[PDB]
Design a protein around this nucleic acid. Structure first.
Lengths: 43, 184, 100, 411
RNA sequence: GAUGGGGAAGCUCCGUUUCAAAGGCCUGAUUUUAUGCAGGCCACCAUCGAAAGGGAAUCCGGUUAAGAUUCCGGAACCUGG
RNA sequence: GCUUGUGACGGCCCGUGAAAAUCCACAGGAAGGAAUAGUUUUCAUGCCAGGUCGUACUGAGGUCUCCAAG
């Protein structure tokens, strides 16, 4: 029915779920690094 | 839990190392030099790394590339074979003999601390044959000796002798006595 | 801003600027190239046929109702007399007596 | 024959799961994905997802069997193994305490090259220029990045060097057709061997790097596009143009570090390439230079900046509400005029572009039928209703543009 | 009846799950001091041994000096993709 | 009536009545599914393919076995 052949990327799933997950993970490792600094000053 | 055969064997050997009563020529090991004195022994011993195979090769090609086209003192290094260390003690050329506590057959190095006490050689049983290995271009060394020295390091070496005499030989005069391993 | 990301028509707010000097450094630019990079090796590639056609050529070719007369258009006779819903009907074969 | 097992034949040996690809290669997932980035391999969609599995409806991504089966014998995989051996043999040297042998291990180190990986990916030169669309977008982004602990300065300096080589060539052989300044950045279009490439350059401001983005995926894309660009630029220069690579003047790189620097020695067809010839433009301080001097030098004009100080000049480009000097010799323009002269090609009048007035809107260069519904099947009613809704959602948005234009024009 | 083990000067015998590291699958934005793989699920054991045991699915008519549920005509069925 | 197949019963035992390949089913609730072909084919119709070896005949104090007219 006069259709044009082309290629299509499907939407990569869990993009928003992992996005928010990495947003949280980055902040968590920052805070853990700060806690390490203080506890090392108690040595 | 279920472990492998060899894992069970080395764990069984570990608990066997503790729970048996042991003869006083062994357990004269493990009564070894403490952290500060060990670090201070190596702060001297690291200044005398035997010239590694690459360094020796490049230098002796430098001798060839220069001397063939267009005086040096004898250099000092640590001395590291058991045949050679027990040669050097009894010469008597050894000022500090370092002995590993962990040796594959224990029977190898059992005479050595007492032969050093006999000859008057100021010895120290240091912890790790790997740790001795590092300062000597080898995986393992069992023994490391320091015969001669540069005069900059001479006073430090003499004090290293006196520190090891006081820290090691005086604290562990009871170690010639007392069968180790009576841990309940 | 309420809609979840990746199910969104524009990755940006359209904005007006009088001067070219007044154009801000677009902050969410690394995010766009990173998401495209992920779209290359993680998003599944499918061969599709896009049906580029008018909607008008989907209705079958059927004769216009005006050339198929007669047929009833509007109501004439409203039968108001019941207190209950007319569930059933029947007509006589002759054509006068309509039963409810 | 014996009765064949069901779910082992057709779609089961045509496709493989990610887990099955990783396991078959005996390679880490990261390194599997690194090779997948280099080789240009992507998950593919089967007609039956569960026949592609062993029966299971499950969240699964399918690769092509012969694609992974072809990746197995490859020099790059072997060189990844060699990097792993080098890694431990270096930390052996470092961890012991010997520094000289470790320094020597650096000297006796070869690395993987992405040379043969492009021959099998883009066998013809016009095919490589069809990819350079996405390749120049990463690279021009990575030029405009502060170096972090993720990304070294050497990486950004080499990327910027390739960017400047690209800008120098396009301004040399005069291959620009369209420009478009957006919020995102500045788009360009270029007939590079007559196939119209498109690419985006951000604005020269510090860019806030999120901790969300993964600078290990992007580094391998950079690593592939970088080598691809080296080979493209050699091919371009040695065919029609110049020696490669060109040198750069040290005291020119000290002044601008942009495009007026990096001098290039050798040993028209389009109206845009003939525009601005015998015109000398004095670019002022206020405008961004590196986004604008590229366009002037591309078409056929000449650049003298305010920045270089820190004659023949016929136009000045100034973005201030109050302009100070106002001589009779020069003509005063807000850069929008240049961004319209490139798009049209016909030299638009500068009467709508004076300093102090509002600019033009800057366009991109890019009953019975309800009764005849009945005789359609469900497989046609579903599709026709979808096409009706797609045209409705367009036309109502067009009505939104018209209503908003009327509500604004009153004000 | 191999394998693991253990005998035996040995040819080889004991033993069949035994104090064997006996393997085959899933999860993941790429695994946060930067591109060296992490976490989980399951716990018995190779193999040979039946043309009378269990087992997917084919019949009729025809045909030769000698072949037929096998060949031919007709009409079928099962299994896998 | 004879041969054989099958169904429901009733005895005979504390004698409770081979295994595995293969096939199906249930419980379970992981995951997936829409606006220019949503997800699902245990529904209907349509396409292709099915390797090796045995296969002749005899088989009658002296190996086993099937069919059985008046």
């Amino acid at each position: 029915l006069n259709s044009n052949p082309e290629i299509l990327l499907r939407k990569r799933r869990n993009a928003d779920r992992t996005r928010i997950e990495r947003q949280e993970l980055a902040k968590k490792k920052r805070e853990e690094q700060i806690k390490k600094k203080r506890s090392n000053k108690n040595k | 839990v279920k472990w492998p055969e060899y894992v069970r064997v080395q764990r069984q050997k570990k608990i066997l190392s503790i729970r048996l009563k042991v003869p006083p020529t062994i357990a004269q090991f493990q009564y070894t030099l403490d952290r500060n004195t060990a670090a201070e022994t190596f702060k001297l011993f690291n200044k005398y790394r035997p010239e590694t195979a690459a360094e020796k090769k490049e230098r002796l090609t430098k001798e060839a590339a220069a001397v063939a086209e267009g005086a040096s003192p004898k250099p000092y290094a640590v001395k590291y074979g058991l045949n050679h260390v027990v040669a050097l003690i009894e010469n008597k050329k050894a000022k500090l003999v370092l002995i590993a506590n962990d040796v594959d057959p224990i029977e190898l190095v059992v005479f050595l601390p007492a032969l050093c006490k006999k000859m008057g050689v100021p010895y120290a049983i240091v912890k790790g044959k790997a740790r001795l290995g590092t300062l000597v271009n080898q995986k393992t060394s069992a023994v490391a000796a320091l015969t001669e020295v540069r005069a900059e390091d001479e006073a430090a070496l003499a004090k290293l002798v006196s520190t090891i005499d006081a820290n090691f030989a005086d604290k562990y005069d009871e170690v010639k006595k007392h069968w180790g391993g009576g841990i309940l | 801003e309420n809609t979840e990301y990746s199910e969104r028509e524009r990755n940006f707010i359209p904005q007006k600027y009088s001067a070219l000097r007044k154009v801000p450094g677009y902050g969410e630019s690394i995010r766009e190239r990173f998401e495209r990079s992920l779209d290359l090796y993680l998003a599944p590639r499918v061969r599709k046929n896009k049906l580029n056609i008018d909607p008008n050529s989907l209705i079958p070719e059927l004769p216009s109702p005006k050339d198929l007369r007669p047929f009833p258009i509007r109501c004439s006779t409203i039968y108001a007399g019941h207190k209950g819903k007319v569930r059933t009907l029947s007509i006589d074969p002759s054509g006068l007596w309509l039963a409810t | 024959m014996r009765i064949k097992k069901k779910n082992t034949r057709g779609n089961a040996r045509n496709f493989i799961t990610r887990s099955q690809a990783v396991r078959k290669l005996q390679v880490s997932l990261a390194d599997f994905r690194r090779l997948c980035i280099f080789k240009g391999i992507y998950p593919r969609e089967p007609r039956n997802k569960k026949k592609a599995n062993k029966g299971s409806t499950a969240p699964t991504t399918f690769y092509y069997a012969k694609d992974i089966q072809y990746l197995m014998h490859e020099p790059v995989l072997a060189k990844f193994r060699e990097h792993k051996t080098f890694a431990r043999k270096l930390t052996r040297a470092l961890g012991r305490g010997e520094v000289s042998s470790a320094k020597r291990l650096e000297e006796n180190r070869d690395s993987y090259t992405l040379d043969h990986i492009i021959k099998e990916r883009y066998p013809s030169f016009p095919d490589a220029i069809r990819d350079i669309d996405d390749a120049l977008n990463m690279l021009f982004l990575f030029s405009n990045l502060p170096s972090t602990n993720q990304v070294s300065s050497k990486i950004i300096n080499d990327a910027q060097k390739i960017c400047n080589q690209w800008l120098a060539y396009v301004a040399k052989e005069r291959l620009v057709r369209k420009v478009f300044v957006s919020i995102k950045g500045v788009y360009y279009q270029a007939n590079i061997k007559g196939e119209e490439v498109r690419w985006l350059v951000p604005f020269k401001f510090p860019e806030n790097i999120p901790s969300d983005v993964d600078f290990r995926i992007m580094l391998t894309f950079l690593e592939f596009y970088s080598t691809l660009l080296h080979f493209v630029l050699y091919k371009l220069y040695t065919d029609s143009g110049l020696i490669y690579p060109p040198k750069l003047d040290l005291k020119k790189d000290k002044i601008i570090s942009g495009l007026s620097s990096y001098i290039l020695e050798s040993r028209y067809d389009s109206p845009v390439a003939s525009l601005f010839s015998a015109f000398v433009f004095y670019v002022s301080r206020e405008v961004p230079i590196d986004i604008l001097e590229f366009l002037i030098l591309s078409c056929g004009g000449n650049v003298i900046s305010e920045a270089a100080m820190d004659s023949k000049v016929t136009h000045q480009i100034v973005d201030r509400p109050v302009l100070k000097n106002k001589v009779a010799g020069r003509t005063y323009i807000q850069p929008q005029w240049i961004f319209d002269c490139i798009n049209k090609g016909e030299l638009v009048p500068a009467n709508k572009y004076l300093p102090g007035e509002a600019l033009p809107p800057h366009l991109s260069p890019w009953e019975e039928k309800k009764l005849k519904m009945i005789m359609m099947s469900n497989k046609q009613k579903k599709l026709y209703k979808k096409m009706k809704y797609s045209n409705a959602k367009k036309e109502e948005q067009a009505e939104n543009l018209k209503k908003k234009k009327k509500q604004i024009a009153k004000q």
